[PDB]
């Protein structure tokens, strides 16, 4: 057996849910860096 | 508990007797200071008496 | 508000500052300024000593109440006073170094008991006493200062403000935290050991009065499960009533901005119903 | 097995979380919108008790967190179920980490609303209405955690 | 300010020495407390006299 | 804060490895048994999905790099906006590479019998599809970004002078060698891999 | 084995995250697009009540989270299957992390749109049209979570 | 062969297929809607022809919704790891592809609707660029709908 | 049921009650002190009027001290794991909420004493906002006291 | 054994180390940041030099608070000590250290801002001392918490 | 069991860490003070041997590590108790991470005092007086580790 | 058990570290002070072989690392005690991570000294004086590592 706590199925759920959470953190850091061009909305 | 009511009677009668016998010079601070301080002294006495009238916790110590 | 302050501010001070030793020091350094108020009046006072001498009578009361409450506690430079006869006796024959309990003989006459001083579980009893003391004195201070609102609306001769703010405030405050302050006194009144009944927990009584009405795990009084439903409905009926009485009867007496009254009464209802919980814990 | 020893850990950390993240969101809502009150009531000191609304609506979030941290706490206990601990952790997080968002949205709206309602008096009702939409988020977290905490000890063996 | 501290040193230490002399249970009554009462009272009463010397000397200042 | 987590995970890995090694149990951190006992369908499906995902995140990357500068450079010179679309096309072909490799890999994806499930061949064709999906998706990612950069320079040098686009299209050709080389290597890696049996 | 003890953990996290991340999304949509209302209604306060549509369409995302949180909360149990916990985790994340995106889009489009609608009044219809496409993202997440939650306890053992 | 943790991967694939696709569609709607709102304050008659990038970003989210619905009709309590990881792959494919395609449509769309107000010949240019970025979501949808057909065989 | 590693959580709950409240009180004292020492150079008469944010910061550390003392006097070697978990929760409840209360008191106090020298009427607004910022730590105190009242209630 | 394992003095040595480490970090920040203000406001006002060293004395008291608890945890370490003893020695060490660190940050920031502006207004000297007292009682509280944890380290241990 | 095989690991890490972090602190205290000296006496080079005091007081807290990393080195055996390794690690960290703080403080006060002592001649006494408080930090760490190391092999078995 | 199979790992990464972390501090002391020589001797090239003393004193600590790496290398064996591997790791870290500090100090002091010694020629004897204190920090680590390595295989058994 691989382990009793860190079994064959838990340890490859925590790789899938680490890859997906990595893609999520990257995509949320893309959307967090999204700023509005305010000079093209004002009168000045 | 009736020795709390018996003290409430002699505090309340004293406060009513001071409401009518307050000095006329500064009435709204004679019958406001003295009547409220008797109320708060009786309130802390009643709270410190009823917590020991029927206690749930016994005093427990080792060094004696 | 500075005419009820003249007693309550030194007394709410003294509940936090409870000691006959520090209280006598503060009373003495206040009475030094009271007896010498003629030499200090015709004198240039800097800001800190101007603050201390402008209030030479707030500190005299703050010392005089601190002596009273530190005689209620047994706290004279954190020591006890064996003035009266104790309500607890210790066993005469016991082995050295073992944990012993005391048997209750009577009740201590004035103030807290002096057999709680060098005690392992004395701090649990002082926690229970001072927590319930703070709850009852905050309840008393709030229900005393809430009657002044009724006296204000009566002097303004506004029955609309009375029925819209005072009565739905009164039977919301008293139906929850007046019931809590009554339940503390009623638990202190019952014995719960001679009766061989379980002593109810009052935190998860008020938790379960709002979550699961009618279910009483430890019964505190006869008819509890049906009276708490009546008190819960009396408290919940005053959330729409305090929010909807005054704007809908100011609008009816114009048959004035209804948006400036309805939004103000919603903010008043949210603020008051928040503060009834937020101040009894403060 | 069904009610293990580490079971009240999740309940105690949920009771902690429901006031920790709630008070953090309410602290952002108090500080960020108190900056605006302390900046605009130098020019307009008559609007102190009028612009105090976002600080009060930030405090109502902390009241929502307090009333769930005092209901998870009396449902705690040794040898309680692990289901009860998971439900109390979920009800802790639902209040805390959504009152965190509601406090962000109250503070960073209320500062701009206090900056704006000293110039335009008609913007104050709009400020209150946006703050109601920002405070109903924490109210929704309160509703989810109360409906969740109602099922914590419901027919649990 | 030494005369104020010295007057409190007279009063407080005299009361403490009297409570050690009479075997008061808030000072002797525990196991961790000192065993002999007057042996502690004899060295607290001399400190009360020392603070009385400081109070008399700083009372003529 | 991310550096704090990078240091914390490193400290926890070092403390766990030295605790497991000092107590004579250091072979319990067993990466080979982890590879032997995880399901080959994880590696196969993960390789297929990351092939077609990372080809597209490079294709779409290059498309905005040489699209936004094409539209910016086309404001004064709008005679580039159709001729220079071959720079979109060269960074778009790296997605059809990953697509036609992901379908060829998913043809090798059947139901294996449980008695021969962690066999030699079934585990081989999980490993091969995993790394041959990685080496195609990452190569098409990097090729799409490189062709997008060398097309964004071409879209502005085209609007500068018309005779420069022919000279800088050659750099896009040498940049688009890379996705085709990844296309070749990912077919050679899963060339001898059989189906799941 | 099919119904383990740690199985309500994923269900409680799915009940929590559905309201947490939609409250984050609705909080960003209220916050970012309420700063624009408070900035552009100090000059033209007559259009205060029509700029409120980004705030309302942001607050719909929190109701999308609330519905899925209630429907996951009333399917939790002590002895539920691990399948039920996995489906409730998926339905919580499908509403939460999609309504977070919808709320980001509503906040950005609303702040960019109520600032440009005071200079050009014809941009309001375009702002509403873009915000409908931003709000159907959270609607699609609601559809996915309802189709999961109908599948949650159907043929479980 | 069909373990107890096997519908985790299918449920998280059904989750990610709409999560990552809605993140990409939200970036493509928000960033290209900033360009619409910035463009149409000085030339407002281009408002309903500049609306194409947010429509294409919506088509991306529809492509993700299709995969999420078609994965959640094949979930069961006792499915194999084969079905679980093939639903995971069908989720990851359309997730990364819709995320990439939405980022590309967002970054191309605002630049396109800004160049279209200065030069009218850039409308056909931005449409022909955005059509290449649209079908990348189709390129993940193909792998997702092919891995869906191999779910229970 | 009462293991050996059980007072670890109680010791961390006794530490974290004073650690994070001291961090919050230290942020509040630092921000408010930078405010005072930059606003009382020109207005030294209202120096002792502006020390109220620093007092409101110190009451947060007093709140942490009280919970840490009450958790300290309930520790033991052979205590339950439930008691350790409740003491950890009661430490974190007062600590990470007094940290937030200290952040709010520091920011509000800096912004209020820098502008209260210009407008004298802003002082009664600054006190009112700092009351709402200090009730944020009072709430964590209440949660910590109600937890610690049940740390040893029905414990075997 | 079980109540007193072999790895039990690890937590005691970490609690003896951390109590001086984090208070030395805090006292070092309170010395350096508030000594920049002393060395910057002395080139024009050198007569107030022995009175502007209040925020470095009040910061060096934090290091003495760490030293006292490190000595007291050091004289309670044993090879066959309880695991409870090591746990609450770690607790005492963290209670002194991570609170004296915060006290040192507050003393450094407040003392820098106070000796920077006390050369301009002479009435701010009584104000910055009153703020540094509130900044130094933060470490005094951690001292009290660790002295109460250290009185229970070997009290009812088996 | 009381003296395991992995027991000299903590003693060797303590013997290394006693000199490693004090060399880092002494390096910072020498580097910033040397930049301050070499930038303050290109105009007044008469203060060259006068301003060498921060470099000397930063070099003393590396001798503080060199003392304890020899006293720990001469108590390292193959069959030593784990208690000895724990105390030697605590002593190495107690000197190291305190002399690192002392070196930070000496390095900041040193150049801040030698760049200002070229203007005011009687800032030198204040610089020495602050550097004494910055160097007693490393002295306190030395005292803590010398009290630890006198107990690492006192009553060990 | 007393001399396990993984025991030469710590000796090998102590032989490696004593030149890695030493040479990447010597490289900082060479580069950061060499950009101060090449930027200064464009106007004063007669001081070229006099300003190169920071580069020489940065090269000396790499020899300090080389000696300890050779002496740890020639005490490695297949069957050596784990105590010997721990001691060699400690010696390698003691040289490397303190010669890194000495190289940082020489690099920061040396370019500040050579850019200042061309305006004032009486600062060269101060640069040497600060640089000896900056360079003895690696000699202290060499002393610690040699006193460790003399204790490595003294009373080892099994």
UniProtKB/Swiss-Prot annotation, chain C:
PTM: Glycosylated.
Protein name: V-type proton ATPase subunit a, Golgi isoform
Additional free-text comment from the UniProt record: Present with 1084 molecules/cell in log phase SD medium.
Vacuolar side: 18-19, 81-128, 188-230
Location(s) in or outside the cell: Endosome membrane; Golgi apparatus membrane
Lineage: Eukaryota, Fungi, Dikarya, Ascomycota, Saccharomycotina
Assembly and binders: V-ATPase is a heteromultimeric enzyme composed of a peripheral catalytic V1 complex (components A to H) attached to an integral membrane V0 proton pore complex (components: a, c, c', c'', d, e, f and VOA1).
Segments passing through the bilayer: 1-17, 20-36, 51-80, 129-148, 167-187, 231-250
Function: Subunit of the V0 complex of vacuolar(H+)-ATPase (V-ATPase), a multisubunit enzyme composed of a peripheral complex (V1) that hydrolyzes ATP and a membrane integral complex (V0) that translocates protons. V-ATPase is responsible for acidifying and maintaining the pH of intracellular compartments. Is present only in Golgi- and endosome-residing V-ATPase complexes; enzymes containing this subunit have a 4-fold lower ratio of proton transport to ATP hydrolysis than complexes containing the vacuolar isoform and do not dissociate V1 and V0 in response to glucose depletion.
Family from the record: Belongs to the V-ATPase 116 kDa subunit family.
Residues of the full protein shown: 453 to 792 of 890
Stretches of the chain found on the membrane's Cytoplasmic side: 37-50, 149-166
Swiss-Prot record, chains D, G, K:
Cytoplasmic side: 30-51, 111-122
GO terms of molecular function: proton transmembrane transporter activity; proton-transporting ATPase activity, rotational mechanism
Membrane among keywords: yes
Superkingdom of origin organism: Eukaryota
UniProt cross-references to CDD domains, sorted A to Z: ATP-synt_Vo_c_ATP6C_rpt1, ATP-synt_Vo_c_ATP6C_rpt2
Residues spanning the membrane: 7-29, 52-72, 89-110, 123-148
Topological type in the membrane: Multi-pass membrane protein
Essential for proton translocation, annotated site positions: 135
UniProt keyword terms in alphabetical order: Hydrogen ion transport, Ion transport, Membrane, Transmembrane, Transmembrane helix, Transport, Vacuole
Subcellular location: Vacuole membrane
Biological processes annotated in GO: endocytosis; endosomal lumen acidification; Golgi lumen acidification; intracellular copper ion homeostasis; intracellular iron ion homeostasis; protein targeting to vacuole; proton transmembrane transport; vacuolar acidification
Cited Gene3D superfamilies: lithium bound rotor ring of v- atpase
GO cellular component, one term: vacuolar proton-transporting V-type ATPase complex
Positions on the Vacuolar side per record topology: 1-6, 73-88, 149-157
Short name of one Pfam family: ATP-synt_C
Keyword Cell cycle among UniProt keywords: no
Function recorded in the entry: Proton-conducting pore forming subunit of the V0 complex of vacuolar(H+)-ATPase (V-ATPase), a multisubunit enzyme composed of a peripheral complex (V1) that hydrolyzes ATP and a membrane integral complex (V0) that translocates protons. V-ATPase is responsible for acidifying and maintaining the pH of intracellular compartments.
Family statement drawn from the similarity comment of this UniProt entry: Belongs to the V-ATPase proteolipid subunit family.
Miscellaneous: Present with 8450 molecules/cell in log phase SD medium.
Protein name: V-type proton ATPase subunit c
Native species: Saccharomyces cerevisiae (strain ATCC 204508 / S288c) (Baker's yeast)
Gene: VMA3
Curated annotation (Swiss-Prot), chain E:
Subcellular location: Endoplasmic reticulum membrane; Vacuole membrane
Keyword Protein biosynthesis: no
Keywords tagged on the record: Endoplasmic reticulum, Membrane, Transmembrane, Transmembrane helix, Vacuole
Predominant location: endoplasmic reticulum
The organism's place on the tree of life at top rank: Eukaryota
Transmembrane domains' residue ranges: 1-20, 44-61
Cytoplasmic side: 21-43
Name under which the protein is recorded: V-type proton ATPase subunit f
Residues of the full protein shown: 12 to 72 of 85
Curated annotation (Swiss-Prot), chain H:
One GO term describing the cellular component: proton-transporting V-type ATPase complex
One BP term from GO: endocytosis
Cytoplasmic domain ranges by topology: 29-50, 110-121
Topology term for the membrane: Multi-pass membrane protein
Subcellular location: Vacuole membrane
Gene3D superfamilies according to UniProt: lithium bound rotor ring of v- atpase
Function: Proton-conducting pore forming subunit of the V0 complex of vacuolar(H+)-ATPase (V-ATPase), a multisubunit enzyme composed of a peripheral complex (V1) that hydrolyzes ATP and a membrane integral complex (V0) that translocates protons. V-ATPase is responsible for acidifying and maintaining the pH of intracellular compartments.
Family under the similarity heading: Belongs to the V-ATPase proteolipid subunit family.
Extra facts: Present with 8450 molecules/cell in log phase SD medium.
Record-given protein name: V-type proton ATPase subunit c
Organism field: Saccharomyces cerevisiae (strain ATCC 204508 / S288c)
